[PDB]
């Protein structure tokens, strides 16, 4: 034994003498673990960054649309119904506040936002538009619904916005990040670790300097190490469910709200009789495409993974003058965490 880069070992099969002790054998074992990890990391890095990219972009891309619709709706009220301000500035704000909240997962009932909107809207119409000239507010809020002053305009808006706000209310992007990030942390069996050590490092224990492991030996070893991991391939390919969803807006619906609200005109068509009774009573899509394009190029990630480890490590794919795990030969002859990834790949929710 020069520079290296009896017998009672527990990994390297000693044909005779050996250059390494039980302690250098344990060194070689931990560096195999570190090496496999780095290789898995490198395999998953480009895909991991791709989904991290788009998850950050797409998340920022809806709050802008809600702010823009709010200001447009506020401006249209200021310009066309100045007698309804500043009260309109308040119930418009109340509604679009709930819009964003509902988008981002809060417990918000859409039929409210619409109903609170029209419950807040009708008293100021009555007092300022229909019969110009505070204690009587609550009667008018109740008579709004008891007398159905807006007809089916609230229901129309309810269905218009509930359909668009439900679809907008990311899980799959973040889950892909979470499974792919799990891959570089996969713990393998102890037998796989002993075999990885024999494949990569035990040749140095026999005193060889340049000999590389046979590719065939690498595949038998890798197919044995990644036996549970390859089962994930079919669930990862079922990418396709994501491609199905991207069947796909909220801007037009929210921008169109003032027009529908203005068609107020219905109510005033009945101001005459209605007053009397109340008197008595009281590139985005382009980004989706490019993501799916790049994502399909990684559809074989879990099936190509054992070949990646073998190809991105020094091997004699020629299977000549190579290390078989215990001797230099002339020609080579012969789950929990995994199941959680399977279970999560639940998301295949993707019931377009």
């Amino acid at each position: 034994c020069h520079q290296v880069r009896g017998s009672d070992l527990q990994v390297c099969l000693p044909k005779g003498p050996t250059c390494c002790s039980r302690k250098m054998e344990e060194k070689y074992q931990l560096t195999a673990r570190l090496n496999m990890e780095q290789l898995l990391q490198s395999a998953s890095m480009e895909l991991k960054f791709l989904i991290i990219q788009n998850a950050a972009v797409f998340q920022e891309a809806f709050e802008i649309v809600v702010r823009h619709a709010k200001n447009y709706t506020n401006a249209m009220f200021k310009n066309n119904y100045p007698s309804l301000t500043p009260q309109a500035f308040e119930f418009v704000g109340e509604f679009f506040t709930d819009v964003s909240l509902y988008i981002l997962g809060s417990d918000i009932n859409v039929d409210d936002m619409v109903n609170e909107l029209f419950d807040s809207l009708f008293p100021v119409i009555y007092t300022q538009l229909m019969n110009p000239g505070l204690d009587i507010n609550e009667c008018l809020r109740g008579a709004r619904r008891d007398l159905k002053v807006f007809g089916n305009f609230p229901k129309l808006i309810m269905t218009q916005v509930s359909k668009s706000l439900q679809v907008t209310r990311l899980q799959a992007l973040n889950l892909g990040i979470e499974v792919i990030n799990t891959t570089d942390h996969l713990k393998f069996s102890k037998d796989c670790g002993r075999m990885l050590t024999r494949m990569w490092y035990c040749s140095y224990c026999q005193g060889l300097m340049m000999v590389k492991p046979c590719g065939g030996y690498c595949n038998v070893v890798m197919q044995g190490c990644m036996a549970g991991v390859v089962e994930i391939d079919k669930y990862w390919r079922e990418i396709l469910s994501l491609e199905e969803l991207v069947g796909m807006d909220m801007e037009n619906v929210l921008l169109g709200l003032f027009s529908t609200i203005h068609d107020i005109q219905y109510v005033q068509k009945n101001a005459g009789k209605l007053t009397t009774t109340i008197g008595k009573l009281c590139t985005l899509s382009s980004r989706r495409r490019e993501l799916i394009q790049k994502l399909k190029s990684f559809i074989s990630f879990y099936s190509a993974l054992p070949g990646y480890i073998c190809s991105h490590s020094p091997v004699a794919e020629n299977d000549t003058l190579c290390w078989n795990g215990q001797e230099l030969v002339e020609r080579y002859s012969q789950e929990p965490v995994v199941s959680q990834i399977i279970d999560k790949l639940h998301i295949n929710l993707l019931t377009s």
Partner: nanobody, 118 residues
Framework: DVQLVESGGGLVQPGGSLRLSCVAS???????????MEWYRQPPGKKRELVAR???????????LYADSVKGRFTISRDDAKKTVDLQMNSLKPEDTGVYFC?????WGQGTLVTVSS
């Protein structure tokens, strides 16, 4: 299901004519007569633009508006008994190529392709 359903799109030569028809379906049929109906065009690689609008009628007249690009060539009409809005398109030009959508303030159709080419 509530659907605005466009039809009558197709291929036509320059100077030809087409009639687009949009049918209001779903029991939207009750509000159609009180709804403004609109036709929009989306040319290839361009934004969607208003082509024609027709107001609700009082039984004697409809207020019709047209984009300047189609003025004197196109005619919007509506049949409240059938719940249809039609766009008669005459003296078609290559610039009239696009997907045509009927709309209301609450609903959009899926659109129909018009191609004006030799």
């Amino acid at each position: 299901d509530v659907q605005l359903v466009e039809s009558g799109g197709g291929l036509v030569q320059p100077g030809g004519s087409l009639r687009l028809s949009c049918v209001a379906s779903g029991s939207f049929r009750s509000v159609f007569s009180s709804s403004t109906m609109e036709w929009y065009r989306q040319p290839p690689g361009k934004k969607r633009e208003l082509v024609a609008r027709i107001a609700p009628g009082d039984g004697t007249n409809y207020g019709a508006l047209y984009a300047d690009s189609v003025k004197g060539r196109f005619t919007i009409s509506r049949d409240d008994a059938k719940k249809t809005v039609d766009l008669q398109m005459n003296s078609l030009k290559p610039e009239d190529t696009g997907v045509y959508f009927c709309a209301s303030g609450v609903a959009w159709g899926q659109g129909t392709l018009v191609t004006v080419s030799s």
